[PDB]
Amino acid sequence: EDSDRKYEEVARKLVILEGELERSEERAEVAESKCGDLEEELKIVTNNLKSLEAQ
Amino acid sequence: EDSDRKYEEVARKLVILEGELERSEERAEVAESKCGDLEEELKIVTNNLKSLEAQ
Amino acid sequence: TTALVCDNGSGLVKAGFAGDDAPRAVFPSIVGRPRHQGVMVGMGQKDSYVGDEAQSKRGILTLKYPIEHGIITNWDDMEKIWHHTFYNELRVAPEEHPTLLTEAPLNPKANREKMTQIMFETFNVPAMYVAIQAVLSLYASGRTTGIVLDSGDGVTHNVPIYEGYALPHAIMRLDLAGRDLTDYLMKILTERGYSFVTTAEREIVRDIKEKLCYVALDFENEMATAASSSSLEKSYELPDGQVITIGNERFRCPETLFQPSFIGMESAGIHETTYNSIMKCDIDIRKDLYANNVMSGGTTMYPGIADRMQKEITALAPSTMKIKIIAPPERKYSVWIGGSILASLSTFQQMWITKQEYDEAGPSIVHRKCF
Amino acid sequence: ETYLLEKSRVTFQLKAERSYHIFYQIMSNKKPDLIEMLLITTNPYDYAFVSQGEITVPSIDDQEELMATDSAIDILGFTSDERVSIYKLTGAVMHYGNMKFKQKQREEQAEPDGTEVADKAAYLQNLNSADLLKALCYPRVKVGNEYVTKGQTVQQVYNAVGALAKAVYEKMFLWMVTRINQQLDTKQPRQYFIGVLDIAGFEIFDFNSLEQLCINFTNEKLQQFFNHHMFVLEQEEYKKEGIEWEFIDFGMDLAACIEL
Numbered sequence: 065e066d067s068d069r070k071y072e073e074v075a076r077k078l079v080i081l082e083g084e085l086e087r088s089e090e091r092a093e094v095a096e097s098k099c100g101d102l103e104e105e106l107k108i109v110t111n112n113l114k115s116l117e118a119q
Numbered sequence: 120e121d122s123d124r125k126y127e128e129v130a131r132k133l134v135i136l137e138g139e140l141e142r143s144e145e146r147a148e149v150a151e152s153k154c155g156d157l158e159e160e161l162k163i164v165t166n167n168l169k170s171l172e173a174q
Numbered sequence: 175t176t177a178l179v180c181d182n183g184s185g186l187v188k189a190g191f192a193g194d195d196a197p198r199a200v201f202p203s204i205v206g207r208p209r210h211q212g213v214m215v216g217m218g219q220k221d222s223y224v225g226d227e228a229q230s231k232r233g234i235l236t237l238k239y240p241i242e243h244g245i246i247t248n249w250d251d252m253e254k255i256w257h258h259t260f261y262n263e264l265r266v267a268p269e270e271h272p273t274l275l276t277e278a279p280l281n282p283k284a285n286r287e288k289m290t291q292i293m294f295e296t297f298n299v300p301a302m303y304v305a306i307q308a309v310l311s312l313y314a315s316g317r318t319t320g321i322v323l324d325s326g327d328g329v330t331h332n333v334p335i336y337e338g339y340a341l342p343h344a345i346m347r348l349d350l351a352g353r354d355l356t357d358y359l360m361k362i363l364t365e366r367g368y369s370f371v372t373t374a375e376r377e378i379v380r381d382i383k384e385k386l387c388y389v390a391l392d393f394e395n396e397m398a399t400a401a402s403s404s405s406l407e408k409s410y411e412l413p414d415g416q417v418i419t420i421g422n423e424r425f426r427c428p429e430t431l432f433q434p435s436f437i438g439m440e441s442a443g444i445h446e447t448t449y450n451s452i453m454k455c456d457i458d459i460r461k462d463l464y465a466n467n468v469m470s471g472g473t474t475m476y477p478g479i480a481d482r483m484q485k486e487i488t489a490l491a492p493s494t495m496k497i498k499i500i501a502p503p504e505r506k507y508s509v510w511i512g513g514s515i516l517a518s519l520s521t522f523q524q525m526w527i528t529k530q531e532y533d534e535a536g537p538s539i540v541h542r543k544c545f
Numbered sequence: 546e547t548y549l550l551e552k553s554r555v556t557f558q559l560k561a562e563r564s565y566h567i568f569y570q571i572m573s574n575k576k577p578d579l580i581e582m583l584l585i586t587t588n589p590y591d592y593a594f595v596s597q598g599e600i601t602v603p604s605i606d607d608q609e610e611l612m613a614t615d616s617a618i619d620i621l622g623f624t625s626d627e628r629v630s631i632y633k634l635t636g637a638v639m640h641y642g643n644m645k646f647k648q649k650q651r652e653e654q655a656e657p658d659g660t661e662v663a664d665k666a667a668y669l670q671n672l673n674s675a676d677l678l679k680a681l682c683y684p685r686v687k688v689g690n691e692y693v694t695k696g697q698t699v700q701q702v703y704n705a706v707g708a709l710a711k712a713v714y715e716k717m718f719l720w721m722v723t724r725i726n727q728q729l730d731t732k733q734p735r736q737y738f739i740g741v742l743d744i745a746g747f748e749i750f751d752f753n754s755l756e757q758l759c760i761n762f763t764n765e766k767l768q769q770f771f772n773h774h775m776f777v778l779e780q781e782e783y784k785k786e787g788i789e790w791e792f793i794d795f796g797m798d799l800a801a802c803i804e805l
């Protein structure tokens with residue numbers, strides 16, 4: 065009974081940290097895709113910068 | 120022994136689940152640092168392009 | 175003064191000072207040499223790394239354990255190992271430090287002899303002594319009876335000790351250990367498409383083994399389970415991404431210790447050699463030996479090994495005997511711990527082999543009761 | 546300077562004596578403010594560390610001594626929180642005795658049964674109780690460049706907590722002495738001092754033990770010290786006296802008993 069209670073406890077731990085890894089991963093990866101988007105946008109604006117630097 | 124090895128197995132699953140949910144927030148927060156500095160340089164380059172748009 | 179305790183072993187050298195609580199320095203007992211030519215002049219690359227340095231430079235080296243099965247084969251690499259230990263892992267002048275050395279039972283006497291000789295000549299210690307790994311492992315567990323099943327990386331022996339007496343005729347050495355399990359895992363990992371052949375990626379496989387493998391309480395049931403479900407598969411990320419997965423292997427690999435036939439060996443499994451070593455001992459001391467199966471060495475650190483071991487050796491022994499398996503949570507260093515304990519004694523301070531005595535009697539002195 | 550403060554008193558004493566004063570002092574109820582604050586009861590027989598000898602002495606009560614030594618503290622360089630800390634630490638020392646541990650059924654590994662006294666002692670130091678009992682029954686030592694968790698048997702855990710209470714009590718003693726000598730100094734640039742030193746004498750009894758042997762050994766060292774000093778002075782005086790006698794050193798006869 066002791067191990068079963070602590071086993072259901074650590075099972076709550078299982079489900080919560082699993083779902084937590086899941087949505088932290090989703091948040092992270094969407095934010096990083098957005099970051100790569102803004103990165104290529106910075107590339108675009110630097111292209112514009114150089115084209116203007118052509119005086 | 121059933122309860123024993125079951126709790127031991129799920130406790131190892133929990134310890135690895137922790138060993139990953141720990142740096143879950145880490146690779147979350149590095150993403151946000153990236154977002155921040157990228158938006159910053161976005162603003163900088165948008166100001167610079169406009170300043171060079173003169174003639 | 176303080177005594178040194180260097181437990182060579184295979185795979186892992188572990189050293190420290192007597193009286194301490196854990197070996198100060200622990201590093202792989204390998205020697206690497208570059209196998210490409212190198213083009214950047216002024217880089218001044220040395221010719222042979224050693225220990226953790228080599229373990230880090232793995233990508234461009236060729237690693238070679240200088241101990242094969244408890245026996246030392248390449249003496250120059252062994253001297254390099256010892257010198258690096260003394261002068262970099264401990265920063266100690268070995269001239270003023272009696273050192274304690276360990277070796278498995280049933281080894282070539284020339285091994286231990288040359289060990290003593292090099293110790294007294296090259297490093298010039300004041301005294302030394304060679305001890306049996308299993309005796310120390312018993313010391314570290316506070317016992318004074320019971321059989322001990324050490325299983326390091328190269329060798330695997332049982333030494334039944336009772337009341338401080340050792341019954342040598344029942345010692346059971348067996349040359350199946352962690353390195354063999356690593357090789358068998360390298361082999362069966364091919365049947366998923368994973369190929370590790372280099373002496374470097376053998377270390378990768380060793381890590382995979384230390385992390386994912388475990389003993390299965392019942393082999394057939396676990397096999398049928400892994401066949402039906404997929405709840406046993408776990409993944410693992412190599413040093414260049416490309417995560418891999420292993421299922422059946424996780425418990426097929428360490429199962430070898432109980433069915434050595436998997437690697438073509440003919441001897442009987444761990445439980446069997448243990449029970450046989452018991453039965454070879456006198457009948458009056460079999461109950462205590464049943465009750466005190468000590469375990470040590472890194473290879474006895476698989477999740478579940480103690481339970482499976484108890485199951486088997488219970489199936490073999492009579493029903494009215496209490497089987498117990500002393501498996502501490504730090505048993506990997508039990509040999510070094512026991513060595514520190516022993517070297518720290520004072521009733522031991524007259525068992526050393528003084529350099530004067532060796533100069534008087536030559537390396538043949540070791541086999542003499544200056545043991 | 547305090548020197549060779551006895552240690553084993555705090556957790557053991559023979560039948561015909563007791564532990565140090567402060568415990569029974571707090572047990573004396575001249576101020577139940579502490580008795581409530583240190584969560585202790587009044588019956589000393591409820592606390593095993595101090596209850597293995599004679600608790601009440603028929604010479605002096607411990608009540609008056611409470612405020613006596615309290616004032617002794619106050620007049621010296623002690624803050625109030627300092628004193629409540631001293632009291633809480635003594636109370637935790639007293640509490641450790643009642644921490645109970647039981648062997649697991651499938652091993653020799655110790656484990657706790659009731660966290661009650663654990664909770665009390667842990668709160669008395671403002672640190673988690675579960676964490677405390679865990680780190681008692683699952684220590685870990687630095688091996689190489691990582692850590693491994695050693696195992697513990699019940700007896701080992703009892704020895705551990707005994708050493709813990711002993712060490713914290715002796716550290717309290719040494720640091721309160723530090724504070725005392727910190728308040729009493731005068732800032733004049735000083736030089737060579739004088740030495741006033743009392744010590745327990747060559748106290749031999751009808752039933753000796755460890756502490757008695759240690760005291761006798763200290764007195765052996767002192768006797769040989771002053772034996773050799775008198776030797777050099779007295780003897781090496783007579784160099785000028787045109788004659789010498791008793792040419793051997795005088796401390797070299799206590800050496801036989803010291804080396805043993």
Ligand SMILES: Nc1ncnc2c1ncn2[C@@H]1O[C@H](COP(=O)(O)OP(=O)(O)O)[C@@H](O)[C@H]1O
Pocket residue numbers: 182183184185186187325326327328329352353356380383384385471472473474475476477506
């Ligand atoms: N957690 C683990 N699980 C399974 N095997 C392990 C584990 N840790 C280490 N090993 C194996 O045990 C070996 C280390 O054993 P060790 O006692 O160092 O041997 P030796 O006494 O010869 O030095 C390593 O080679 C490794 O393969």
